[PDB]
Amino acid sequence: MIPHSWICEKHILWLKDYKNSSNWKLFKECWKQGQPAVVSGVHKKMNISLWKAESISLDFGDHQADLLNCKDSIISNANVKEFWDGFEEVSKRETVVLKLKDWPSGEDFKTMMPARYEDLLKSLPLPEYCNPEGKFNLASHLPGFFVRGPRLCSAYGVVAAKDHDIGTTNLHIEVSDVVNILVYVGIAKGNGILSKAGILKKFEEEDLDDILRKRLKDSSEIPGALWHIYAGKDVDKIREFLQKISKEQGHDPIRDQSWYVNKKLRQRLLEEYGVRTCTLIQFLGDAIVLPAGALHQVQNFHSCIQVTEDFVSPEHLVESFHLTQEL
């Protein structure tokens, strides 16, 4: 048997055993219909010490890069060194929510962080699809022009700012199939920030599936980020909704990646267009697998380091090619 549940109105496949070699057989069935999946425990496969903030900070902290303020997408005054100093120490940062996006990425990730890249390839779940040598992955086989390498993203949590209208990743469409693994969760301290225990209670105030609540009540799990995921089929409805809300407040808002859809807006989106949200908490070691054309947004509660890898399954190639040609 392949241990699993379905989360969020039975829409997301939770594959509960990262060591099960047959995970792909169950995944094949749900993927066919564009359903997301999450595989938990991938951090036990990884050399997780390699992915700690202290380590990543030291290795690649010499490279200068732009830091984004997540509230307004204005590029910050902070340098990379200041970003990492503030990752878990709030007083070194109302403080702002910073993101260090796609640094490094692609060939630079492979070459500048070779041991992490090797660890990644070794640890990717559902390797039949997500690994470059997987039999259902077309990524390394297609001509160049069909396709849009790994990306690292690090960002503070929104808790210190006390502003859960901030997205650390704004609502946007993904162009290829993607797997996102939460590889580090940093508990921030000082400046009156809510503690680890209070942050758990804030996760508990979210509208969650019971299966998610059980995990949240498991003291060995470490929750990091809040995800909202939408079907690609609903994109035109969501675009209209955001154009409407925009007009009420005084143009393609999905292409702009300019919106975090907060609690009140998600509820109105459901009422006024019937568009449903999948809610997920991503715990340390969770690999969230999304098909091309799916939309999602992320809100870190704690500081999080995510690694994302692109792949190309047959199931979403047509949709992927179209979206890539469009970009």
Applying CB under 5 A, the residues found at the interface with Na ion are: 113, 115-116
Contact call for residues 281 and 223 (beta carbons, < 8 A): yes
Q: How far apart are CA 240 and CA 40, in angstroms?
A: 35
Answer yes or no: is 174 a known binding residue: yes
DSSP for 231-295 reads -GGGHHHHHHHHHHHHHHH---HHHHT-----HHHHHHHHHHH----EEEEEETT-EEEE-TT-E
Between 113 and 139, CB nearer to Na ion: 113
Cβ 106 to Na ion shortest distance, Å: 15
Answer yes or no: is 172 a known binding residue: yes
Cβ 117 to Na ion shortest distance, Å: 7
**Of all helices (H) and strands (E), which one includes residue 98?**
strand 98-100
Between 93 and 116, CB nearer to Na ion: 116
Answer yes or no: is 319 a known binding residue: no
Between 7 and 53, CB nearer to Na ion: 53
Between 99 and 116, CB nearer to Na ion: 116
Q: How far apart are CA 258 and CA 18, in angstroms?
A: 35
Cβ 105 to Na ion shortest distance, Å: 14
Between 43 and 316, CB nearer to Na ion: 43
Cβ 50 to Na ion shortest distance, Å: 7
Cβ 111 to Na ion shortest distance, Å: 10
- 114 cis-preceded (ω within 30 degrees of 0): no
Question: CB nearest Na ion: which residue?
Answer: 115
Residue numbers after which the chain is interrupted (C to N above 2.5 A) read: 93, 148, 250
CA 113 to chain centre: 20
- Which tokens hold the place of 112? 């500048």
Please enumerate, by residue number, every residue annotated as part of a binding site: 172, 174, 296
Can you say which residues are annotated as belonging to the binding site for Fe cation?
A: 172, 174, 296
